[PDB]
Design a protein around this nucleic acid. Structure first.
Ligand SMILES: [Mg+2]
Ligand SMILES: [Mg+2]
Ligand SMILES: [Mg+2]
Ligand SMILES: [Mg+2]
Ligand SMILES: [Mg+2]
Ligand SMILES: [Mg+2]
Ligand SMILES: [Mg+2]
Ligand SMILES: [Mg+2]
Ligand SMILES: [Mg+2]
Ligand SMILES: [Mg+2]
Ligand SMILES: [Mg+2]
Ligand SMILES: [Mg+2]
Ligand SMILES: [Mg+2]
Ligand SMILES: [Mg+2]
Ligand SMILES: [Mg+2]
Ligand SMILES: [Mg+2]
Ligand SMILES: [Mg+2]
Ligand SMILES: [Mg+2]
Ligand SMILES: [Mg+2]
Ligand SMILES: [Mg+2]
Ligand SMILES: [Mg+2]
Ligand SMILES: [Mg+2]
Ligand SMILES: [Mg+2]
Lengths: 194, 171, 49, 101, 328, 77, 132, 138, 538
RNA sequence: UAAUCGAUAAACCCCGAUAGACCUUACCAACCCUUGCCAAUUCAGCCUAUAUACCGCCAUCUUCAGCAAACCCUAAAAAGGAACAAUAGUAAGCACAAUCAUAGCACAUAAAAACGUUAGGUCAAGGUGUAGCUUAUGGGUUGGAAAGAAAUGGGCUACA
RNA sequence: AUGUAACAC
């Protein structure tokens, strides 16, 4: 007993909305799509293949759940979740006076059962040295203490930490390195007078 | 070793060796006979040698309006169903080893005098069941080519006739 | 883990949810060989007998 | 079943390598340092030589995971070149194509 | 297959309406480039063959033009040249020869009445006229032709067009006339730029063998060139490379009237010198008038050098040289 | 996500000085152990319990082998 | 002669699918990839495990839909969920289609420890691109 | 015309903790084909303009990783078959952006990531000073 | 379900079949996982999903009683074997292991119940708060309330209090056995409620819900103490349950058939209901939407159905109706109301929203669109719903052929729709002549359709094909097609009609004969008229 | 020598090997184990023979343009099938061509190159038909694989 | 200048 039904194209209305049909990621099922779409290399007398029984349309990624009207609806839904950026921090220079420390961290996404990427442990802490209370002699001791991590042109200090298993432990170790450099830069010891 | 194995089409194509160089020119037919049997014929899809009885493949979903449970037949039922399968296999073998008798026209091995029934209908829908066609000569004719060397071309001569006075011959 | 792969797929083959054409081919060829009469001997009978 | 007895022996060799991997590290730490006394170092050579043979990382052979070819294997896919070509010409691997420039 | 074409037309219209619905645009102004970017957004195939990408167009454009039914229900053919095998092509030759005979008869009547009121309009060379390609004539006649038949038809068309011309016959001929685009190798002269009280400075880009060169030149200074912050003599010790730096200025007799500064990256010394030479040549077009720009073109300054190092082939040594081939 | 490394902080991973308390303070044992603990501080892939296991293995090794340190030529505790 | 992933020219009667009708040098020119996943990029890891999972999926679907499977699978990997896209003939009852769908879903979810989707399109016969 | 009523049920709880501020957030997507990356760029820019982010997108140069393999099974080293992997990059720069907006934008982009691509996010954030540095000296 | 048209279920039986097939596939694959756990031991997912691991149904330690007891309890027979193994080695089971074993016996499973009772009380003085709990919910299923009352007495000797489920099952046990006196059980329920207040236990939602469940199956006029119970619920501040509200609707529905005062009380209280978002925290909330639609289908009102549909749509759509069976009951009576108490413009618009999506029609909702279009005089709408009912209604089609086709003669036929009429006739009368009782009413309808369409030969062929089926229509059809052939001047058809009517003895053969003398006088065929008379007299 | 194998005219000779100190290793000498990887199997396992049985992957003619299903004709037909001012040839298709890549055309390169020939290479990537073992042609451990009387191919460094 | 002796439709 064989049964055959016409697809959803005949029952599809003119003014029906598409995000109600396609909520999430889909394999481009051709029965629910009313568009006659053709892809494939044609024969010299032939035409490209239609949407039924075609694996190239099954291979291709689809943006049918990302139609622009659906983008407007979804972003109007996410509008309640977002918060406003401060008006006083609009400029890079005022950001430089207010928040001098910037921290580069990375998160990675991949298709697979495993989440962990070993390069995700890295933490790169950058500080402009003009925003601190280092003295002259303490500043010179800071450059001779840290060496290559300080840029002589743009006057920035960059500490990259890798050794800790977690990004929070790397962040704590980097900010610990910054504060121990600050506390040990001011110390004048007995061999510093020679 | 599960990744190592292959597909039945590849296995049969490597087994019968129909594309080999022996059958190409005519070098074959000395000691060459391979038979292809479809192994997916008598499969009930859910049949297994342990004998598990599945609610969708082997037996239907609903009994007395209720939902059936996953069950297993008895061992005695297992050699009964296995006996039915293997007896189907020698039934297929008995049907396969039976050969149709070839009606001889003039001699035992020649094609002279053998009839081929009515000729094929034409493009206009005309159908000729009253004519009969007979082979008078079969002859293997060879040709010399640049690539293949010997090129065997079978030519035959037949006659058609309805028995009412209309007859013809062709090659 | 090829052992677990082969064991799982063999158990599915005998439980009749997966159908394996290659082991079907080996079973049919061994059946034809035993029908012809040239099979695998018992362990220990080959050399002295 | 693995496809070959060489594959089976390499699985066992990797197993004893993981089982004894820490002790080789601990002994070779004593071995590869010149601050340690030589009287201790020759002893450390004695317990590194008394270890089982198949626990060493140099006995680990990179074979194909499909057909166990001993050589011609790409390290990224762990596949032999014939099997890699067989899956690559059928388009079963993403991003791999016949090269044209 | 006519009803198939009508079905394709109507479901193409319905699918166009659904595509306008799912984009949220105006369906009355929804056009073919909108369809193209719509399909390129919704089904984004990255494929090197441009014909293998997903398309939804007019079914008349996609489906090939088909032969109609050639006979009635009684078996009688509609057209009187059906038994020639090529009815449309031979009807076209019949119509062309009928027009040629009518032209000859009308011109004989005009000769008898002693009037020559026609003119030779065969020369459409300022328009850039060409006849139909055999593929285009096959598409028009919806039938396969041959090169000999095509040459026969074109020489009959020349026979018709070389005669005195009537308006109907010129309208018949101009169906088969095609126009070429504009043929010109004249470059676009970049206008001079004035910036912060500096007069007549120009900019040029050069590329030769991986070396990219920016050259900016001032017409208000003396003759010196500053390459990458150092002097040209220090940067290019090679006298040949300094001659490459000379060559456009000595070609235009303006060696000391321009002050240049340069930024070149990549390649070696001769590649950088050639890139700087091409960049100075392209930068000097603003100062220099049009006939001397063409003189530059036939001197070969303004044309880029396509000689790029080839790829090494597998089984070979240096992309031409193979290994030592042993005969036995 | 899901791996907190048993709630450990960076000070248990970096500074291993509190497990070096029972060692000969002036010999080559301190040299060897500060190289080892510098390696354990630099290593990202290894857990703190296994680092304690490595230090206790080294302690156990130097505890079983005592006489060879005496005939080495330097006296170590 | 080049013989990889090609169908040989017979008398003119063998039906051919679009993927079998194109030579491997048409991959990413005219035909695409039957599997899409992350691990084959430039600076990305874990390609071999995805490769062996790909292989085991091809053999398991080929033996799980015996004869009613038309042609090669489409295997999509997108944020740990694995989409298996199939062309299946109208051979078996839809009872048996849904039985095998639920069975394959639960079995592969518990075997690769990841969420699985089984997406099917069921066709009358093998789709013919050329010859015939 | 069958309209279900009161579809909205949000759960937003505002904590007393100050929200994290990011200076910049770089999204580098890598893919195999250009059209998917182009359409995904259009999607991301449209979501960015409706969220009010005012972003800049640039294309980093591609790199191609090439290798050579043997053509035959047994012995033919003169004739080789070469393979090619193509990766393409698109980079989104996100400037002057907050924490909850960062989270919801990133997860909306992440759940709408297609099958054949990957991406890295690089977050540089705003933090004034630790509590042991501000103005003490030992 | 997969929305591929081969896999789209045509009917509700096919929908249930496909869903249970997928569930059987899930159960079969999980059976494979639990049968062979060693093949799934390897973990690839690093965040380590615990539900994806295979589950062990085996006891961990075999011969140790204190572990093996609870191990075989947490999986009936195994718990009994573990208890027997603990008892045979003189190992004393404590008050917790015996409680778990008694709970495992009561959750699964009548002489073994008394044996388990002797096991509970004879060996150890096991605590009341497990022992009476287990046994009193056991003899609810095992039908023995006297022992439950005896355990209640034994509990009240031993100073311990009675919880909410105690008075639940005990009010059920006292109420369910009635020997010709309902007041003696109602007063006992009142005394148990008073002692529930006395023993310092707060009476829960399901306590008064269980009292109402007791009140349901005895009196139709026992709804006054049910209303006082409902108001006592609203007094104490606990939000009332939808099972309770369903049971109130059940009594007031039983009272609805004599008088509608109970119905207006229902409508007032649901008018109080309709403004709240709902959280179904009760297990018995399944038949609520069944009964609240049953009262509306009984009293034929629809604005109430509008706001109850909004109530279904408001909080959460699917979690308040338990089964697909009661869900198609809901939608069938919902369309039974909406078809005739609203207009066609919204009826056809919710027709395409509900019927091809939610459930496929049964016969009660098949007949009613047919009577609604016949009331509203809508003839254009017939072929599309016929093509729909061909899909969803193959079972009821032969039973409802006449009731489908009875609309076709009530209206008048303009000449624009004759293609649709001819197709709707031709598909039915090709399918049921290619095979099946087929009535003559459809012959009347098809003949008046081709009479209005002006086609004589196909209608004559159809009547001739019906009279090859060894039965005849009535003579009004014969006169109607005789008028059709009289307007078209066809004498041989009239000859065949009258000959095969006189051979089959119609009662109005005299009228047919007089009509064909009129026909043959009009067409001047009086010689063949006299020939027909000669044939009839022979 | 106790001590692998294959290739071995163009189309072998830094060739399987984009790779041998043990491992790889299939070789040899000593020792050992025979339901001996697996859920099960009067069964596993074999780098044992046949590339003259094969599939899979290729070399060569070859940057040669031809191959071929289905028809038609020849005062027979083994076979052949064209004359453009045209004298029997139509021909779906595969090759060539066209298209595509080397991020703009163009050129060039790459890629492609049909049917077939050399019973051309590969049972040792892997599976396999047939023919041979099953206390051994199978499975493990240890130790060893020399060497140049000579000839020759391809390279590197030079002879300034 | 030559190249013997086991090809099967
Ligand atoms: Mg004979
Ligand atoms: Mg093997
Ligand atoms: Mg190695
Ligand atoms: Mg060179
Ligand atoms: Mg060999
Ligand atoms: Mg040899
Ligand atoms: Mg040779
Ligand atoms: Mg050895
Ligand atoms: Mg060796
Ligand atoms: Mg061996
Ligand atoms: Mg060969
Ligand atoms: Mg050989
Ligand atoms: Mg040609
Ligand atoms: Mg010929
Ligand atoms: Mg052809
Ligand atoms: Mg191009
Ligand atoms: Mg070219
Ligand atoms: Mg090439
Ligand atoms: Mg080409
Ligand atoms: Mg040979
Ligand atoms: Mg073999
Ligand atoms: Mg060489
Ligand atoms: Mg001689």
């Amino acid at each position: 007993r064989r049964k055959a039904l016409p697809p959803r194209t005949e029952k599809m209305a003119v003014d029906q909305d598409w995000p109600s049909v396609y909520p999430v990621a889909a394999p481009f099922k051709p029965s629910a799509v009313p568009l006659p779409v053709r892809m494939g290399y044609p024969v010299k007398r032939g035409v490209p293949m239609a949407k039924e029984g075609n694996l190239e349309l099954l291979k291709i990624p689809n943006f049918l759940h990302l139609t622009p009207v659906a983008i407007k609806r979804h972003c109007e839904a996410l509008k309640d979740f977002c918060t406003e950026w401060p008006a006083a921090l609009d400029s890079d220079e005022k950001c430089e006076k207010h928040f001098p420390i910037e921290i580069d961290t990375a998160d990675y996404v991949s298709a697979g059962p495993s989440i962990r990427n070993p390069k995700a442990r890295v933490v790169t802490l950058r500080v402009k040295l003009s925003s601190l209370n280092l003295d002259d002699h303490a500043k010179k001791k800071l450059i001779k203490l840290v060496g290559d991590r300080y840029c002589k042109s743009t006057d920035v200090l960059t500490i990259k930490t890798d050794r800790c298993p977690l990004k929070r432990q790397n962040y704590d170790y980097a900010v610990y390195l910054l504060t121990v450099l600050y506390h040990e830069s001011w110390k004048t010891e007995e061999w510093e007078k020679k | 070793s599960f990744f190592t194995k292959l597909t039945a089409d590849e296995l049969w194509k490597g087994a019968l060796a129909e594309s080999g160089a022996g059958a190409r020119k005519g070098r074959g037919k000395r000691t060459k006979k391979k038979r292809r049997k479809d192994l997916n014929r008598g499969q009930i899809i859910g049949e297994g040698r342990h004998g598990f009885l599945w609610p969708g493949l082997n037996i239907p979903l609903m009994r007395n309006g209720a939902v059936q449970t996953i069950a297993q037949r008895s061992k005695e039922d297992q050699e009964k169903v296995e006996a039915d399968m293997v007896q189907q296999r020698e039934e297929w073998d008995r049907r396969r080893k039976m050969k149709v008798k070839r009606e001889r026209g003039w001699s035992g091995n020649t094609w002279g005098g053998v009839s081929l029934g009515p000729p094929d209908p034409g493009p206009n829908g005309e159908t000729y069941d009253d004519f009969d066609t007979r082979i008078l000569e079969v002859r293997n004719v060879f040709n010399m080519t640049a690539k293949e060397g010997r090129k065997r071309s079978v030519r035959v001569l037949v006659a058609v006739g309805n028995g009412k006075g209309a007859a013809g011959f062709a090659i | 883990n090829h052992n677990t792969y082969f064991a799982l797929m063999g158990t599915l083959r005998f439980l009749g949810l997966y159908r394996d054409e290659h082991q079907d081919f080996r079973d049919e060829q061994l059946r034809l060989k035993k029908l012809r009469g040239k099979g695998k001997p018992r362990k220990g009978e080959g050399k002295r007998a | 079943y693995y496809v070959d007895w060489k594959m089976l022996r390499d699985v066992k060799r990797r197993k004893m390598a993981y089982e004894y991997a820490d002790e080789r590290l601990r002994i070779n730490s004593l071995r590869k340092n010149t601050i340690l006394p030589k009287d201790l170092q020759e002893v450390a050579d004695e317990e590194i030589a008394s270890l089982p043979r198949d626990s060493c990382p140099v006995r680990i052979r990179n074979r194909c995971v499909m057909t166990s070819r001993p050589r011609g294997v790409k390290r990224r896919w762990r596949l032999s070149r014939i099997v890699f070509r067989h899956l690559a010409d059928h388009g079963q691997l993403s991003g791999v194509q016949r090269a044209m420039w | 297959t006519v009803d198939f074409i009508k079905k394709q037309i109507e479901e193409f219209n319905i699918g166009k309406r659904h595509l306008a619905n799912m984009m949220g645009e105006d369906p009355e102004t929804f056009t073919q480039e909108d369809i193209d970017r719509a399909i390129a957004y919704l089904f984004p195939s990255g494929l090197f063959e441009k014909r293998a990408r997903p398309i939804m167009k007019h079914p008349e454009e996609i489906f090939p033009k088909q032969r109609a039914i050639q006979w009635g229900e009684d078996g009688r053919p509609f057209h009187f040249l059906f038994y020639t095998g090529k009815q449309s092509y031979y009807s076209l030759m019949h119509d062309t020869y009928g027009k040629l005979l009518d032209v000859e008869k009308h011109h004989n009547q005009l000769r008898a009445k002693d009037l020559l009121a026609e003119k030779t309009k065969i020369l459409k060379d300022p328009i850039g006229s060409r006849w139909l390609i055999k593929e285009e004539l096959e598409e028009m006649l919806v039938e396969k032709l041959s090169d000999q038949d095509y040459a026969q038809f074109i020489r009959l068309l020349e026979r018709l067009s070389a005669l005195p011309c009537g308006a109907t016959e010129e309208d018949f001929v101009n169906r088969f006339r095609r126009s070429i685009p504009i043929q010109s190798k004249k470059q676009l002269i970049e206008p001079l730029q004035y910036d912060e009280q500096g007069m007549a400075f120009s900019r040029g880009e050069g590329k030769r063998k991986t070396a990219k060169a920016e050259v900016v030149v001032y017409g208000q200074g003396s003759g010196r060139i500053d390459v990458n912050g150092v002097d040209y003599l220090l940067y290019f010790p090679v006298t040949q490379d300094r001659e490459q730096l000379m060559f456009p200025l000595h070609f235009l007799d303006r060696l000391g009237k321009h002050d240049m500064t340069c930024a070149v990256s990549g390649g070696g010394r001769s590649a950088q010198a050639g890139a700087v030479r091409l960049a100075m040549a392209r930068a000097l077009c603003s100062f220099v008038t049009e006939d001397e720009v063409e003189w530059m073109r036939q001197a070969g300054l303004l044309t880029a050098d396509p000689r790029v190092r080839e790829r090494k082939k597998p089984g070979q040594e240096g992309a031409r040289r193979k290994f030592t081939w042993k005969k036995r | 996500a899901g791996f907190d490394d048993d709630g450990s902080e960076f000070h248990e991973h970096i500074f291993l000085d509190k497990y070096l308390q029972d060692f000969p303070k002036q010999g080559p044992i301190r040299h060897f152990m500060e190289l080892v603990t510098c390696g354990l501080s630099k290593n990202p892939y290894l857990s703190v319990k296994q680092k304690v296991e490595h230090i206790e293995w080294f302690r156990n090794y130097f505890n079983e082998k005592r006489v060879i340190l005496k005939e080495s030529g330097i006296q170590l505790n | 002669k080049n013989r990889a992933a090609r169908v040989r020219v017979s008398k003119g009667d063998k039906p051919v699918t679009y993927e079998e009708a194109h030579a491997p040098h048409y991959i990413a020119h005219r035909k695409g990839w039957l599997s899409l996943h992350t691990g084959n990029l430039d600076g990305e890891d874990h390609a071999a495990e995805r490769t062996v999972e790909d292989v085991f999926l091809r053999k398991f679907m080929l033996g799980t839909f015996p004869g009613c499977l038309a042609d090669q699978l489409v295997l999509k990997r997108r944020a740990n969920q694995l989409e298996i896209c199939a062309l299946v003939l109208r051979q078996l009852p839809p009872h048996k289609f849904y039985f095998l769908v639920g069975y394959s879903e639960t079995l592969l979810s518990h075997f690769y420890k990841c969420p699985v989707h089984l997406h099917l399109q069921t066709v009358p016969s093998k789709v013919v691109y050329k010859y015939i | 015309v069958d309209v279900p009523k009161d579809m909205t049920k949000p759960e937003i709880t505002i904590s007393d903790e100050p929200d994290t501020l990011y200076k910049r957030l770089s999204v580098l997507v890598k893919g195999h084909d250009k059209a998917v990356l182009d359409s995904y760029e259009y999607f991301a820019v449209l979501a960015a303009k409706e969220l009010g982010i005012s972003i800049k997108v640039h294309e980093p140069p591609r790199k191609i990783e090439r290798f050579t393999l043997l053509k035959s099974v047994h012995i033919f080293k003169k004739h080789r078959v070469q393979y090619e992997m193509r990766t393409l990059y698109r980079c989104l720069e996100l400037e002057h952006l907050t924490g909850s907006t960062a989270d919801v934008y990133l997860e909306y982009i992440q759940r709408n990531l297609p099958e054949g691509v990957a991406m890295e996010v690089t977050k540089t954030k705003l933090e004034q000073l630790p509590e042991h540095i501000r103005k003490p000296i030992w | 379900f997969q929305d591929d048209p081969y896999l789209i279920p045509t009917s509700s039986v096919e929908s249930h079949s496909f869903l249970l097939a997928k569930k059987s596939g899930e159960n079969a694959a999980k059976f494979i996982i639990n049968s062979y756990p060693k093949y799934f031991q390897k973990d690839i997912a690093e965040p380590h999903i615990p539900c994806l691991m295979p589950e062990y149904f085996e006891p961990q330690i075999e011969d140790v009683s204190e572990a093996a007891l609870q191990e075989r309890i947490k999986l009936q027979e195994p718990s009994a074997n573990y208890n027997f193994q603990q008892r045979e080695q003189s190992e004393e089971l404590e008050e917790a292991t015996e409680a778990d074993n008694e709970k495992s016996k009561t959750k699964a499973g009548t002489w073994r119940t008394k044996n388990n009772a002797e096991r509970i009380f004879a060996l150890m003085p096991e605590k009341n708060a497990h022992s009476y709990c287990t046994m009193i919910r056991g003899m609810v299923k095992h039908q023995a309330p006297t022992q439950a009352l005896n355990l209640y007495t034994v509990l009240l000797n031993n100073r311990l209090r009675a919880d909410v489920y105690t008075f639940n099952s005990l009010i059920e046990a006292t109420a369910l056995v009635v020997n010709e006196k309902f007041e003696e059980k109602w007063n006992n329920i009142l005394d148990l409620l008073k002692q529930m207040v006395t023993q310092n236990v707060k009476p829960n939602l399901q306590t008064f819900n269980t009292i109402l469940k007791c009140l349901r199956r005895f009196y139709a006029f026992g709804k006054l103490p049910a209303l006082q119970t409902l108001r006592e619920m609203k007094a104490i501040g606990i939000e009332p349950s939808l099972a309770t509200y369903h049971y109130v609707i059940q009594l007031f529905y039983q009272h609805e058939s004599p008088s509608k005062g109970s119905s207006l009380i229902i409508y007032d209280i649901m008018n109080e209901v309709m403004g709240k978002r709902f959280s179904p925290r009760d297990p018995d909330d399944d038949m609520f939407f069944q009964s609240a639609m049953r009262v509306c289908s009984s009293l034929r009102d629809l604005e109430l159905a509008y706001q109850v549909h909004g109530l279904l749509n408001t909080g959460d759509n699917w979690k308040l109706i338990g089964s697909d069976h009661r869900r198609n009951f809901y939608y069938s009576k919902f369309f039974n109301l909406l078809c005739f108490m609203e207009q066609i413009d919204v009826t056809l618009k919710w027709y395409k929203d509900l019927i091809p999506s939610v459930f496929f029609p049964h016969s009660q909702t098949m007949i009613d669109l047919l009577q609604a279009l016949d009331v509203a005089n809508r003839l254009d709408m017939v072929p599309q719903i016929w093509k729909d009912s061909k899909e969803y209604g193959h079972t009821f089609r032969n039973e409802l052929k006449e009731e489908i086709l009875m609309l076709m003669a009530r209206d008048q036929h303009p000449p624009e729709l004759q293609v649709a009429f001819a197709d709707c006739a031709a598909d039915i009368k090709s399918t049921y002549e290619s095979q099946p009782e087929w009535p003559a009413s459809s012959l009347n309808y098809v003949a008046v359709l081709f009479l209005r369409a002006g086609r004589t030969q196909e209608a004559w062929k159809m009547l001739g094909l019906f009279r090859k089926h060894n039965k005849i229509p009535r003579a009004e059809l014969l006169n109607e097609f005789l008028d059709s052939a009289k307007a078209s001047s066809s004498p041989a058809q009239a000859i065949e009609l009258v000959k095969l009517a006189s051979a089959f003895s119609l009662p109005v053969c005299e009228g047919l004969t007089r009509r064909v003398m009129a026909e043959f006088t009009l067409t001047q065929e009086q010689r063949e008229a006299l020939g027909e008379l000669t044939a009839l007299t022979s």
